[PDB]
């Protein structure tokens with residue numbers, strides 16, 4: 373069970389955090405996680421390349437579709453919707469969507485879900501990390517909601533696997 | 540090996556066509572394909588719900604990632620990019636992107652790939668089917684490229700599994 377990751381990209385960060393999620397929330401053994409220039413995962417007979425094939429293999433192996441997807445709120449539709457837009461946007465956020473991210477979070481603890489962190493939160497967390505990390509205090513106060521939420525994800529999902537340093 | 544599908548939606552059409560693709564291009568047994576109001580696939584021990592979990596299970600079982608994704612042209616990046624935008628757009632095409640679809644196809648046989656039909660072509664084929672099916676001849680001539688390409692996909696990938704009637 374070895375998962376190999378890149379080290380400059382948010383696709384790897386997502387995968388590390390999902391694992392932290394799997395342990396934080398769900399739960400047997402866990403992947404090795406070595407480093408390389410490209411993303412891969414080999415399990416038993418099979419082999420998987422890229423984030424998405426990798427992601428689904430991971431979710432499949434840990435049975436954790438419902439928890440990451442808010443199946444129990446029928447917000448599955450909405451989770452892959454959010455995470456599909458983002459991976460096609462190449463994980464970049466424009467001010468306009470930063471603003472609307474910040475509105476969602478005024479009145480919700482999590483981006484899609486009511487109850488708990490889902491796959492949408494893990495995706496947006498690693499995407500905003502650097503555009504939030506490299507930031508001035510005066511500006512955040514515009515996105516104080518994204519800020520409050522970022523810290524809640526950081527102090528609750530982050531564990532051994534994630535290497536991103538605390539803000 | 541039973542795959543159960545919806546019947547009013549393009550998510551099912553995509554899955555049927557992928558199977559037709561698997562036989563047309565790749566290639567052992569094949570799924571039963573019964574009908575219901577929701578998408579599902581059960582294989583051996585495991586069970587899968589929705590199009591994407593279903594899709595990846597299918598691709599995983601038939602080993603056909605490279606062929607659907609143009610791995611051999613390193614256009615994997617670009618394939619999931621195209622198909623992620625579309626599934627988040629809820630499989631609807633605006634005139635502006637219809638127009639740009641139609642430009643791609645003036646000078647390319649397939650949407651992303653040079654060589655062969657990929658996962659992007661299967662996705663856009665089922666999405667444009669009805670906005671193309673319910674159409675006037677005068678208008679198509681604007682999208683004559685999308686039209687030429689639609690017929691090429693229809694006469695080459697379509698097989699037993701797809702139920703959409705010929706245009």
Ligand SMILES: [Co+2]
Pocket residue numbers: 439442443444445487488
């Ligand atoms: Co829940």
Ligand SMILES: [Co+2]
Pocket residue numbers: 457461
């Ligand atoms: Co966008």
Ligand SMILES: [Co+2]
Pocket residue numbers: 606609610611612654655
């Ligand atoms: Co090829």
Ligand SMILES: [Co+2]
Pocket residue numbers: 624628
């Ligand atoms: Co769009």
